Amino acid sequence: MKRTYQPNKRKRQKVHGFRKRMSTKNGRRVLASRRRKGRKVISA
Amino acid sequence: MELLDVIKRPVITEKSMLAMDEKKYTFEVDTRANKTLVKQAVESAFDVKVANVNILNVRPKFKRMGKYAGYTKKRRKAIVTLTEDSKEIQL
Amino acid sequence: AIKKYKPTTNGRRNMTSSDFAEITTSTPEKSLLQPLKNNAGRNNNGRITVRHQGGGHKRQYRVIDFKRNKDNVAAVVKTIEYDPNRSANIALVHYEDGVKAYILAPKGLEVGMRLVSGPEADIKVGNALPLENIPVGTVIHNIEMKPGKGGQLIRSAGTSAQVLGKEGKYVLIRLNSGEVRMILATCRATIGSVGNEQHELINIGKAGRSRWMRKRPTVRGSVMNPNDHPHGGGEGKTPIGRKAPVSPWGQPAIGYKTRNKKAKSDKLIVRRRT
RNA sequence: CCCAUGUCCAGGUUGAAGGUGCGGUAAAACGCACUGGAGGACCGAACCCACGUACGUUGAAAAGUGCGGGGAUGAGGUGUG
RNA sequence: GUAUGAGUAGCGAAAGACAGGUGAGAAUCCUGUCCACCGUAUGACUAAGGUUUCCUGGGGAAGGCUCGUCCGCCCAGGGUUAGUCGGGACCUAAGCCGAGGCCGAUAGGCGUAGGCGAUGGACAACAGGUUGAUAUUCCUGUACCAGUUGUUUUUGUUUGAGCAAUGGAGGGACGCAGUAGGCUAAGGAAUGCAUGCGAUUGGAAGUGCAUGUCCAAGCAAUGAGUCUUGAGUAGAGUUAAAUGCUUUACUCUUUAAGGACAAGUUGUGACGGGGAGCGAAAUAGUAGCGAAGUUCCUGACGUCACACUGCCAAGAAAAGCUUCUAGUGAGAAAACAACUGCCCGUACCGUAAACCGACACAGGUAGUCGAGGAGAGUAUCCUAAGGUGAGCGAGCGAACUCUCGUUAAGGAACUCGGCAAAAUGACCCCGUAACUUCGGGAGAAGGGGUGCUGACUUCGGUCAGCCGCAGUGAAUAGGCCCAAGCGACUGUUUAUCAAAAACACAGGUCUCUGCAAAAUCGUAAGAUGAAGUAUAGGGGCUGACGCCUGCCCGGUGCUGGAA
RNA sequence: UGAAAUUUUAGUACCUGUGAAGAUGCAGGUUACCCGCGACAGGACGGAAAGACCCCAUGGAGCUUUACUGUAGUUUGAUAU
Ligand SMILES: [K+]
Ligand SMILES: [K+]
Ligand SMILES: [K+]
Ligand SMILES: [K+]
Ligand SMILES: [K+]
Ligand SMILES: [K+]
Ligand SMILES: [K+]
Ligand SMILES: [K+]
Ligand SMILES: [K+]
Ligand SMILES: [K+]
Ligand SMILES: [K+]
Ligand SMILES: [K+]
Ligand SMILES: [K+]
Ligand SMILES: [K+]
Ligand SMILES: [K+]
Ligand SMILES: [K+]
Ligand SMILES: [K+]
Ligand SMILES: [K+]
Ligand SMILES: [K+]
Ligand SMILES: [K+]
Ligand SMILES: [K+]
Ligand SMILES: [K+]
Ligand SMILES: [K+]
Ligand SMILES: [K+]
Ligand SMILES: [K+]
Ligand SMILES: [K+]
Ligand SMILES: [K+]
Ligand SMILES: [K+]
Ligand SMILES: [K+]
Ligand SMILES: [K+]
Ligand SMILES: [K+]
Ligand SMILES: [K+]
Ligand SMILES: [K+]
Ligand SMILES: [K+]
Ligand SMILES: [K+]
Ligand SMILES: [K+]
Ligand SMILES: [K+]
Ligand SMILES: [K+]
Ligand SMILES: [Mg+2]
Ligand SMILES: [Mg+2]
Ligand SMILES: [Mg+2]
Ligand SMILES: [Mg+2]
Ligand SMILES: [Mg+2]
Ligand SMILES: [Mg+2]
Ligand SMILES: [Mg+2]
Ligand SMILES: [Mg+2]
Ligand SMILES: [Mg+2]
Ligand SMILES: [Mg+2]
Ligand SMILES: [Mg+2]
Ligand SMILES: [Mg+2]
Ligand SMILES: [Mg+2]
Ligand SMILES: [Mg+2]
Ligand SMILES: [Mg+2]
Ligand SMILES: [Mg+2]
Ligand SMILES: [Mg+2]
Ligand SMILES: [Mg+2]
Ligand SMILES: [Mg+2]
Ligand SMILES: [Mg+2]
Ligand SMILES: [Mg+2]
Ligand SMILES: [Mg+2]
Ligand SMILES: [Mg+2]
Ligand SMILES: [Mg+2]
Ligand SMILES: [Mg+2]
Ligand SMILES: [Mg+2]
Ligand SMILES: [Mg+2]
Ligand SMILES: [Mg+2]
Ligand SMILES: [Mg+2]
Ligand SMILES: [Mg+2]
Ligand SMILES: [Mg+2]
Ligand SMILES: [Mg+2]
Ligand SMILES: [Mg+2]
Ligand SMILES: [Mg+2]
Ligand SMILES: [Mg+2]
Ligand SMILES: [Mg+2]
């Protein structure tokens, strides 16, 4: 009974990290959307 | 940074007092200060000769007063061991 | 020769393999090795472009000299070695100047043979010459289509081509497929035929052996769903149920030629086969 | 599904090819012993799986448990990236 | 928001009992004693993950499925110490990014040099002690690695010691399986050694009982053993050069010699440490003290070591590293003294109440160590070290449900179906059919033996005796046979109602593909196919093996033809 | 210590009949002091799920082909280079 979420610091950052978001245009769109909505944490 | 700004304050606790008996003193230092810089600052400030310097990073500790919760500031703790034939630091 | 395993187990039953008698050593020349990763039939996009590939044993690439453009000195055949990358066996040869190299192993090659390359080289098994210097009727292999590019044609185990005649700046050749075509006279080739002729008689014997050789299972289109293959769907076993059998992408699979109809080489191909 | 790189498979059993020796022959084929240790080999823990059945079915559990069950050197299990 | 169901279901795998203590209050907290549970784990380490949950002192609002004086909860303080351990200032795999560049309505895609990137390679320290909480991190002792200054002794200063390439090289450097050997851990036995003790329940001062029965890294010496031919002459190469390295021919050597490795052992580290136990007050078993540390048996796939042997599926790279000159050079080396050596992690849980499952959840969670008797074994039962008594209980001992034991006579009459249960089960010996692809079928089937005590043995037995209902006396261990269909087989599949006759498979056949191959991803570039070349690659169908695979080309496709 | 599904309000019997044709509740008759506890499951066309079967909508989606209309690709010619 292996569940969907298997925590891993490195994988979390490499997939959802701030630098990964910046690396692509659409990731920057996500960051812009987070900033517009006012999220305290815009990236993982 | 300035040497006088490297060292922030001493640490007075049971463990620190036992360290003093062994002629080692515990100081809170600037979080960007490496043990070599700490050694230089201690020598300039206290006229003593430093035998060794150990250093740790004390993580921020979670706290909460009433409905508001946050973290205490992160700290850097340095245990400075003075050589023999060296003046003791007076506090 | 081909050694047949006794049917100790159903998997072992009917299995055959090569005794590797011709193989003289199992230590490849460290200088000529290169790393190879298994692409598993996946391109730079990461998509599967060729099916039924992946897995299997690890391999080290052996740098084979198909150019054979070192005409200065002769090369003594030190060893005959097994090569996981190709069906044919390879041969380690030392040039008298101290350059080590790998070549294909022509049928009948033996340790100690002093192969030579260049126009003046005598017509002997393993030597390399430009096609213009090879007399008609010779059996050759490791043919190259562009001068200096290196042998490309007739390199599998047991294959061989024959020189039929000369004309203009080209030479007439019958390839292993039976196709007759012209090849530029300045292109080189190696006299003889590729050894390891027995390779075609091996009986793999069990599925796990194919998996070792990096062949993943092949699923027939007739047992897929309609959205997976044109043959897919239908209740129970079904016939082809189309005008003609087709590939997963609709290309007919029986008799439908695929060679480009405006192929540049058609001017050089005299008689086709396959 | 795949790539790279690691790692795991208690303990038993069986006895392929090959080799040696002795018979046999004109030479052999061939026969018999010994050696040798093959296998998607055998039995069976861990490990992996999930065939039967009972229970559970506002469950201990949004797929399980109990008793049995299959594989267990491979087309194997599994970690990391 | 509050009812009803209802003071009902549930309170989440199992052993607790009593005495004392604390307290307003105790089945639930603490101490004690006995009992019980796990012990290839429910023990000891650790990676990830969590992120303070760790320690000390307080608290009982809420959380804890009861209670709680208690807690992984709340409040207040405190706790993580590195030149050597893991990571970085070292290397690279897959993969990723990517200066110019290629391609493309825009956005961008791809990619060279060059980098990043471990899960791999390289790399200098170990034992003990110490705190409430850290320790290869602090302390004690003794080391090693890199480097600086100085002293001294050596020797070179441009016929030039020494250093030394990003360059030439060597090396690093690797699969699976199989036993055999060496060595050490580890375990066991002992009327070996040391300490303590003499029982009260009938007996024992002895061959009685209990306990313990040893220690590094580094340095020096040695080393079971492992691997390897070594020289010379003449050449040719190694973009320049080389004394390095590669290699061709020819002589001598090749049971050797030389060379390279090597687990471990002995000594020193050790006047040290640990150690049964004894044991202080001022307040504990705590300072402190402290004996002996032998022989024999077994003995590791732990290590020598992927060493050897065999096999086919043919088993990373790079750097560190060692050499070579090229270059660079006036200072180098040895001893000794002193001194320098940065950043990140270090708490705690970690087969779980601290991680993933919304829960303090009967699930899942990589790696290491994982003892004893019987035993092949990490199986099984009971135990050691060690850990634990499961976060609702007390009664009663109705139906009914579940889990479990036994059952007269019968023995499948049940039922869709022997579903379930029962039965067989370990080892040793005897014996074993049709059929067969000659391997099998086969542990077929069907039988016999097994305990204990003497005697003798060729050490496996034999004979003799003894006991029980029963001797693998408990736990753990195949039920078997006859025949038919389907699939050759091992395998794979609908995570979560289908594990199959379905898929796959080795084999067969057809067909495409002459290489910028066909095929596929992509607008393209660029890729895979392949660093492959028709004995290869793609596609269709069939599906081991054995015997075979008949007739039709009118129709539909495909192939050819070109008037 | 302490839920849940359900729940129009309920002081919530049986038979025969009647009724949207299968009544605890309507008619006639019969039976029955008030409140519970432990049990069973005939009924409340019991609870759970705006039936999946069937039909309908000028609903949707996946799939097929010699349905219609298109189209990527492939091919052939003219033309530009
Ligand atoms: K938020
Ligand atoms: K077979
Ligand atoms: K090969
Ligand atoms: K197939
Ligand atoms: K079908
Ligand atoms: K089950
Ligand atoms: K309620
Ligand atoms: K209620
Ligand atoms: K407390
Ligand atoms: K590592
Ligand atoms: K040097
Ligand atoms: K060491
Ligand atoms: K030593
Ligand atoms: K620590
Ligand atoms: K034993
Ligand atoms: K055991
Ligand atoms: K309790
Ligand atoms: K009762
Ligand atoms: K009952
Ligand atoms: K009956
Ligand atoms: K029947
Ligand atoms: K049988
Ligand atoms: K008996
Ligand atoms: K059995
Ligand atoms: K099947
Ligand atoms: K089959
Ligand atoms: K058949
Ligand atoms: K099955
Ligand atoms: K299937
Ligand atoms: K057939
Ligand atoms: K085929
Ligand atoms: K067909
Ligand atoms: K096939
Ligand atoms: K026809
Ligand atoms: K026709
Ligand atoms: K009605
Ligand atoms: K009822
Ligand atoms: K649908
Ligand atoms: Mg530190
Ligand atoms: Mg294929
Ligand atoms: Mg199907
Ligand atoms: Mg289709
Ligand atoms: Mg069909
Ligand atoms: Mg049919
Ligand atoms: Mg097997
Ligand atoms: Mg697991
Ligand atoms: Mg098995
Ligand atoms: Mg009730
Ligand atoms: Mg409980
Ligand atoms: Mg066990
Ligand atoms: Mg605590
Ligand atoms: Mg506390
Ligand atoms: Mg409570
Ligand atoms: Mg790129
Ligand atoms: Mg601790
Ligand atoms: Mg007495
Ligand atoms: Mg040169
Ligand atoms: Mg060993
Ligand atoms: Mg710790
Ligand atoms: Mg009975
Ligand atoms: Mg019957
Ligand atoms: Mg009946
Ligand atoms: Mg049954
Ligand atoms: Mg028994
Ligand atoms: Mg089958
Ligand atoms: Mg099977
Ligand atoms: Mg299912
Ligand atoms: Mg199933
Ligand atoms: Mg079929
Ligand atoms: Mg009516
Ligand atoms: Mg009625
Ligand atoms: Mg009324
Ligand atoms: Mg209903
Ligand atoms: Mg409806």
Author numbering:
A (entry chain 6): 1 to 44
B (entry chain W): 1 to 91
C (entry chain G): 2 to 275
What text comes from the article?
PoxtA and OptrA are ATP binding cassette (ABC) proteins of the F subtype (ABCF). They confer resistance to oxazolidinone and phenicol antibiotics, such as linezolid and chloramphenicol, which stall translating ribosomes when certain amino acids are present at a defined position in the nascent polypeptide chain. ARE–ABCFs are comprised of two ABC nucleotide-binding domains (NBD1 and NBD2) that are separated by a helical linker termed an ARD (antibiotic-resistance domain), and, depending on the species, ARE–ABCFs may also have an additional “Arm” subdomain inserted within NBD1 as well as a C-terminal extension (CTE). Cryo-EM structures of PoxtA on the ribosome reveal that it binds in the E-site and, despite the short ARD, still induces a distortion of the P-site tRNA, leading to retraction of its CCA-end from the PTC.
